[PDB]
Design a binder for these strands. Structure first.
Lengths: 238, 230
RNA sequence: GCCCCGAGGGGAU
């Protein structure tokens, strides 16, 4: 039931590098969860951010077994030097007291209040796979299919079809503000950063509930492709 | 034949043209003498302009004489203005061409469009403000095929609509003040068609050139969807 | 762009 996003507060210069962060993360699992590398839907997501001198990394876990297996290892890293591309000292491992740290449960994603609208902030470059070509436009179905798919893959609930068809086929965009930035790990790829407000016309109370739930879930799962490299870090706003 | 024109009316007077006033003014001109035209307006307050895009020869032959006859006259486009000049060139949004010249090339797999007024599309009964490749390019292609002498082979259409991705996007949605509950995109988008054949690339570049005249998306008759290739 | 999976996803510093 638990969802967790733990933030590593880092000491050192520069920021974590996507590939190094992912390598560091997968290094912790090759012991205790060798299987997650090959699975087609990741039960985790990585991120990083901050200004120079105030860098941080983040590990989001969408399944309980992983939290159990990994959280003890992460806490044991406090005060130690790790490599996330460049070397850093893990000052603290935070569940609370950081904007991108948090814990919840899957049922709690569904405690509303419901809303016809969903304002998503994309905080790192976000893009999607179509036909083996990356696409940076945060269209409603891409975003919400991305969220819904994983919510279901790892949560205890799936949506009634009415709700789903509403979410994916009927959700529109009310406003969009932002720009694309290069995804440095990829070839000829950029990703959207900014704010998009989605709206579901004729939304039932239920539909609105689920929309809000996908919104809340995004904080943990991220959106789109290559969340294992820190892309698609997003959260709901008002 | 196959003339294409975008004539700019540079204005003397305070304020800016209003969409409804401008379209009404144009509608008048239509009696007296897809839409085979588009309208636009812009500039700073006090240095405003309006523009009339004519996509078919008949309408040019019929309307150009009326617009030129307004030089130095007062017109109402919401606020009152004196028409300083009617320009087919010498202004960034004025121009004349022909449909064949739209295919002059060079062909290119990239197309950078600037959306200079709010741009949106009619979708399932609602207005949608996101400049998706399929929407932008379908809009342009539909109009180009409506008024031009050529039609894209089906495979080309398919490539353009389904394969074109976005290399970069920068901008924001702004309210469409004439509308209810509608916003439109303003900014810059660079479209890219991977592995475009020569023909596909040629068509992409031609749609790009046609945009200057037709505009993109819904309600171009109110000045929305004003755009150009960069 | 390449491999794998199957609207889109995964890819061990």
């Amino acid at each position: 039931m638990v969802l967790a996003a733990l933030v590593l507060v880092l000491e050192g210069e520069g920021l974590p590098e996507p590939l190094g962060l992912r390598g560091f993360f997968y290094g912790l699992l090759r012991e205790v969860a060798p299987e997650v590398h090959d699975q087609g839907e990741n039960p985790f997501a990585l991120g990083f951010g901050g200004r120079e001198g105030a860098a941080w990394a983040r590990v989001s876990l969408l399944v309980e077994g992983l939290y159990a297996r990994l959280a003890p290892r992460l806490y044991a890293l406090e005060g130690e030097e790790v490599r996330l591309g460049p070397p850093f000292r893990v000052r603290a491992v935070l569940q609370e007291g950081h904007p991108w740290a948090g814990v919840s449960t899957y049922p709690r994603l569904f405690q509303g209040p419901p809303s016809r609208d969903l304002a998503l902030r994309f905080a790192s470059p976000t893009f999607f796979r179509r036909k083996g070509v990356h696409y940076p436009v945060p269209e409603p179905r891409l975003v919400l299919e991305s969220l819904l798919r994983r919510l279901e893959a790892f949560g205890p609930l799936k949506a009634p079809e009415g709700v789903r068809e509403a979410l994916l086929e009927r959700t529109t965009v009310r406003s969009l503000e932002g720009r694309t930035l290069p995804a440095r790990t990829e070839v000829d790829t950029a990703g959207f950063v900014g704010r998009v407000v989605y709206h579901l016309p004729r939304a039932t109370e239920e539909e609105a509930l689920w929309l809000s739930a996908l919104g809340r879930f995004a904080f943990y799962s991220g959106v789109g492709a290559k969340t294992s490299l820190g892309y698609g870090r997003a959260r709901a706003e008002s």
